[PDB]
Design a binder for this molecule. Sequence first.
Ligand SMILES: Nc1ncnc2c1ncn2[C@@H]1O[C@H](CSCC[C@H](N)C(=O)O)[C@@H](O)[C@H]1O
Ligand SMILES: [Zn+2]
Lengths: 303, 333, 107, 107, 82, 82, 153, 98, 98, 93, 93
Amino acid sequence: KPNYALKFTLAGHTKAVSSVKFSPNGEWLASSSADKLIKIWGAYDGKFEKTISGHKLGISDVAWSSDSNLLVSASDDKTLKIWDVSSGKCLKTLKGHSNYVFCCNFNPQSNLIVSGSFDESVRIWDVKTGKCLKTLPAHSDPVSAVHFNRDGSLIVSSSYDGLCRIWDTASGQCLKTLIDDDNPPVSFVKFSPNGKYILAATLDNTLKLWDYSKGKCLKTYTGHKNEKYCIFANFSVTGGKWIVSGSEDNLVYIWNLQTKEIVQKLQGHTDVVISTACHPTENIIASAALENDKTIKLWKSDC
Amino acid sequence: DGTLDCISMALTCTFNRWGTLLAVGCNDGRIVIWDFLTRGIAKIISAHIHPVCSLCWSRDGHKLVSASTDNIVSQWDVLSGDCDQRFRFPSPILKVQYHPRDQNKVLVCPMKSAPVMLTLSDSKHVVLPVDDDSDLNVVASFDRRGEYIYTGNAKGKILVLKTDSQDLVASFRVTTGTSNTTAIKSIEFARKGSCFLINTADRIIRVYDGREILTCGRDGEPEPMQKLQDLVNRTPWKKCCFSGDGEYIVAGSARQHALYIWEKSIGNLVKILHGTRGELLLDVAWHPVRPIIASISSGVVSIWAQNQVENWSAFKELDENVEYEERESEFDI
Amino acid sequence: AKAKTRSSRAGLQFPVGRVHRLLRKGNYAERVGAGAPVYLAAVLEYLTAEILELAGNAARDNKKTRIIPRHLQLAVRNDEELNKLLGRVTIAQGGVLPNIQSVLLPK
Amino acid sequence: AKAKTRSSRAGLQFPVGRVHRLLRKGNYAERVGAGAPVYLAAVLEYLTAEILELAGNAARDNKKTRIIPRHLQLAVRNDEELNKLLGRVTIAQGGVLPNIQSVLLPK
Amino acid sequence: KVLRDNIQGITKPAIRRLARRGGVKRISGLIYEETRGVLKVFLENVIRDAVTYTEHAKRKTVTAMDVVYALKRQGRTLYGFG
Amino acid sequence: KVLRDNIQGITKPAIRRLARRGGVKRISGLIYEETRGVLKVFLENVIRDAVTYTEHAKRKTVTAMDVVYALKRQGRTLYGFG
Amino acid sequence: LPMPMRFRHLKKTSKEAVGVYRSPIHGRGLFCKRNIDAGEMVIEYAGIVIRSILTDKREKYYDSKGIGCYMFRIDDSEVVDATMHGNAARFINHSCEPNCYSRVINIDGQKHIVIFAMRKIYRGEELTYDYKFPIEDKLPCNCGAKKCRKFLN
Amino acid sequence: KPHRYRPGTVALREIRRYQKSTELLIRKLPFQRLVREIAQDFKTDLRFQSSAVMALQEASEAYLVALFEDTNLCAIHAKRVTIMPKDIQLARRIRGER
Amino acid sequence: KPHRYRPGTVALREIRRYQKSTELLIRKLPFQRLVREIAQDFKTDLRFQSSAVMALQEASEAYLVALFEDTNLCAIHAKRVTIMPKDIQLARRIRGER
Amino acid sequence: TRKESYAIYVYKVLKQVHPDTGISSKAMSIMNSFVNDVFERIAGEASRLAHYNKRSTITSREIQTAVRLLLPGELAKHAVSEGTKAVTKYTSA
Amino acid sequence: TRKESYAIYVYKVLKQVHPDTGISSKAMSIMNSFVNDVFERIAGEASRLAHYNKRSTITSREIQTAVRLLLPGELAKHAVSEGTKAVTKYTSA
DNA sequence: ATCGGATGTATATATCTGACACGTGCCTGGAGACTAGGGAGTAATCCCCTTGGCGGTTAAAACGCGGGGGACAGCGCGTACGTGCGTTTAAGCGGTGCTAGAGCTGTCTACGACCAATTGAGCGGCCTCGGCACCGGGATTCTCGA
DNA sequence: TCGAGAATCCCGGTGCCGAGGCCGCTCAATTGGTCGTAGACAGCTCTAGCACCGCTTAAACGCACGTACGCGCTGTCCCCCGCGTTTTAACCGCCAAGGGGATTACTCCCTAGTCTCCAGGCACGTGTCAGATATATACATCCGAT
Ligand SMILES: Nc1ncnc2c1ncn2[C@@H]1O[C@H](CSCC[C@H](N)C(=O)O)[C@@H](O)[C@H]1O
Ligand SMILES: [Zn+2]
């Protein structure tokens, strides 16, 4: 039962927030919104670092490079853009997606970028050349969550068609297709810290922790509110092992890892908590809510 | 099955310790480290002005020794790209090979002189002994763990020396079918175990076990663990290699520009990958952690994957008509 | 003075004494090894058993108690080693084993 | 008592004494007739006469005095009865008599 | 009693019966006489040697043993007659 | 010193030379190995019997006389070696 | 070529003879990745061989899951059902002018539903056969051919 | 309406029953007269054992069967079912009988 | 301009000179090695007289020439000039070697 | 005139192999002639071999070599095994 | 080792038929082996003939009949005439 | 691709028999016992043929490479041959009858076997030289584009 | 279709070793007695062969006829012949160590030969059932209309 208390409320995004991601060094937080802008913030004190502009439509997903220096932003303009966080310049521009890119993520070596779009296609892109290296008709619905595994050899992918599809990267094979004996729209998905497991956020107020080494769901997390928006979840291993997730009831739920019991309820947001980011080293949770709030909030626990 | 156009004047190739980068010798005398996942070049180093004919990777994958056609041998780091060291010797070098368990020691097979083991820390050189002292063309290579050195002459002799002492720990003379002698074209090893192979001038490849070679010791009568050849076309092998595991053996036919892949346990031919007849096959290599094969021919790199039933296959997929065992409660409620 | 023939002493049927006398009266060599007639009769007994086995097999195959020359011909032709032994040999009332080439059969 | 060879009284060149010795040591009969070696030696002499005659004929036709095996082969294959006598006989360094089939000729 | 031309006693049905036994379906006519010839040829050898044996036997009739010996000398031996 | 596969020592030019000697103009490739086979087959008999003679001779080397006797027993005798 | 032997050669070479890509006819379609001459086996419709008496109860059962009913009538007794467990032959599109035709051939006493080539099919062509579906009261046919029945039924 | 078998079928059944049967296929007395006619050429007034001439006849018949067999096989190699005298001459040539 | 003879003509002249010549047509040492390889199958360490193995080789060569001859003649009977392995098998079958 | 044969021994070995099976008289004569022929073959072979060794004694070893020359493979194998068994039983008398 | 042959007699009959012609020792040995072969032939067939007649004395009549067996036609005719002439000459003294 | 009919073939049965299994008395080859000699087996010695290796050469094999040449496929057609059905013919059974010649026994005598005494026809061994094998060069004749 | 070109034939010339002629050195051929015996021959049976003839009939010759395989021709394809170049290892000549091949010299264990006896084998009678034969029957299979 952590005691995450509110230390700083981060606000300034003039539209619906969509993604907040702590920098891998924990020094900055990239708050993205539908306002075509990213906002770099001081991840330890809520100090507004800067705003990176240049996109044409709402940025649905943003993701840091594995070295805290670069940021990939997938915007509703059907394009991705890689900006140097240390300077803000658009180092790369990724064109080719025919629809709304809903998810973008680096590989563990930060040399690859996986991007799932509204066009139901997952595309693999370079970082030093930015060219689209691969493309797959991954799902039958807009792909809203893509993520490399612990080492970049495998990519888990989520779309609105309930499929939790794990693909090979060296050859692009649709290795596994996790289904929970139903078709609930799985909005978000991600691997485990050890890569052996995979957390899938479904749009029925459910977080399913599957054993990817087994291919079957092990843990269930219910009691939160996630039905429409692509709510982002976090693992807490730096301090207490928690499962943190924003919610559509202005609350940020925090369950125990093993027991799957609600161990804390970070209230204070006034809108749907659209995104959550876990500090890579510290016990700082950046919980960002949607347009009726437009605020990110830093929460620090002592247990 | 894949190719690399971004590489020009490709002559030699070599995978890193993990199968992540490919060092390519550029006939203008350059080194192109081409990266796999980005599908692009990872580094470019204009080493010398003379072409590069040999390369090898360090254990950590950071040091690269290279031999040029101008008797030059130089080391370069994968990050700095600078000349770590540069040496010159008579009898132009045919091969250089990092000691697989010591990135300081390096074996050097020259054209005419006996092979020599050098170190990159100190400018020393220990010449390896040769049986007849008149072969003038001897291949030599460390084993998988750099514990020994196998040396094959032009007369079918095989001397297994202790790399540190250069002293005979095993020996035997190989035949050429009837009883004859032959030029040992190459002494190749596998990334797993002691299962190594010998390419000779008789267009026949002989897989052996180095443990059994040490077992026979000095002047034994060892039979090859496996025998491979182009029994149908009688084709000499410009190059041969194992697979990443050691159960598959690739041989490059420059005579017809094809790739014949056999097994090691049984030795039967896995299959054949046919390249264009016009291209002159030059170099072959296997992806040490993938069933993929890189080939170099006429300055062009070609990829040869071995894919699975997937990329669309995963409803459930079956092969043949499955007669469902009708349970006794099938029509029951 | 116990009487016991060399055939009995070898436990065989073919007369060792008769074949020995025959070799003596056959003018093949000045002297003969004593065990040579035994060996020769043994070989003859073995091969005769071999052939008559297949002979009786074909006979009972035709429900025949007494073997007919056709049976011997079929037996020697079916056996590879025997035929090779008797390829340049013909048999009275032997005939030819059934043999039809492929293209002879209509289609 | 001067000893003339039996071949002299027989008027032959092949050694009839050697012939009778080979007969007695060949184990073909208990005793060889008196005139049998003479007869067979005469037959052998006549055969040799015919053969070497044809051989020398062929050799002179090939502008040669020394008779090589080729001449013997050609002489053998050039005479019908000799060939039939030695059809089942291979000859060393003989080769084949020059023979080309009809259809093989160009047009 | 002088005998002549009994080679035509070999009837065409007999030749075709032999062919059927040999496993022959269709035959040309020009075979028959040739067959006869070959037959005679075969005969022309063995029977002669036969009487030759009979000649050395100082006998007037031919013995089955004699033709057995002939076929033996001709490398075409036969069984069932001693 | 163990010997193996020297049947391929029989070169295709040698086979075609033998064919020309036999009076053959055009040949298929599939003949060669078959030839080899047949050759071996021939060999497979005589040489064996050869050592068999040598075996009975209680000797270690093979004598020309032995193979002459073998070919004699095989009805393919040869002249010029005793 | 024996029917079992040709069936085995089909099972061996069908995977390198058929493919599944985007179908201009309907969704995902079987395509001819290499020239398929007439008479040669195109692809077996692999799937669970059930009895026809088992179809209805299974059909209704499949109505509980809404998964595509992949059933082809073997004969008056059995049916190949490939709804959940089958092969790529499910994705062959109906074609009123089919370059392929359906048969049920016997192999050592077991009936396999094999689609053979009605005509010489060529590389890149979408492999399609006639479902032999009866006339209904109408599933529109997108074969694009000339003699389309205006429907699958 | 009268029926006639297709050609060869009757001959095929004949082949079957003949390979099945084992008796002789040549009438005795004509063969014996032929043997006597051939014998009188080398010496007149030569008698014969019945078994002797019978063995002659049967050995000759078997020799002819072997000739028919390998000639028919050669004709197969000649891509024909109808034998031709050149085929028999060829077979004899191969058998060393020429 | 370069000249090339019509096919077979060179081979025809080869046939002529080979029927004319009488030396061996197989290289000695390979044949001898083959003989030793065949011999070691029945017993190892068996020596050979030079004349012995020479006689082996020449007898085998002559046997092969006879086989080539009658196979070529059979191929003529097959109305072809190019020999086929079935022709050799047929010839061996006729020679009683099967 | 007593005419020697082998019919009794053929009948004996037949009963020893097939007690129920009978035999024809003509077939019996065929068998007898066959035995005579093969025995003559092996006898001539042994004599010729001994002559090649200039040994006037025909012993068992000559018989073994002759039959090994005459019988194809396993025929000769079983034959020489039976002959060795018989000669050993004879020596142990 | 005093090895017996016929070479001198071959040369003799050569000079008798072809005075100004040479030979090769190879072809000489060929002719020698041929002589030995036809000789052993005649010997075997004469012995087998006498065996068939149950005789034990191979005499001139047996030789002549053996030649009649082995040689074809006029070859055998001239051979028989020569043998008879030589026998007559030898018996005349 | 099928069914109906015709015809040809495997089956059960009855009985007839004649080869065939069986039993005999009488013969003689085979066994048993014994003696001679000497072929075969063993040993020590020499040779020498072989088996193995070595270096240089190139004729030879391998490889490849057009490309015209024939294997082969199919297709028309027609002659030659299977076939069912006629006819007439000698084949076969058998039974008689005559004896010519195999096939037998008993001489009796010439005839090699064999051994012993004798030695020059013949054979390993040694010069030796001349047809012959090889070479190179020039004239001869086949063959492929006009 | 008359030349060009190429593979060949022959001629002169060179040098060689196998063919041949000649030489000592036997042992194997010759000579002459002597002996036991192979068979040459005489002279007998009898039987198997030879031929006669009649009676029965399956079997052979010829007919007509459909028809289908042999053949003759065509166009295709491929593929093996020809030639050029590149490779290699056969060959050739030599050297060398030895391991078996051949040899001689002993030594004797086995076989031939002799004689004795009897007992298995063989010709010879004798029931007797395996199958050969014949008939009616059910089954298998071609062939043609559909
Ligand atoms: N010829 C055709 N035209 C339009 N739809 C078709 C069709 N054949 C089959 N279908 C549809 O496709 C389904 C069969 S699966 C056939 C392949 C199809 N393209 C697919 O991706 O699924 C059926 O439900 C049917 O409704
Ligand atoms: Zn359609």
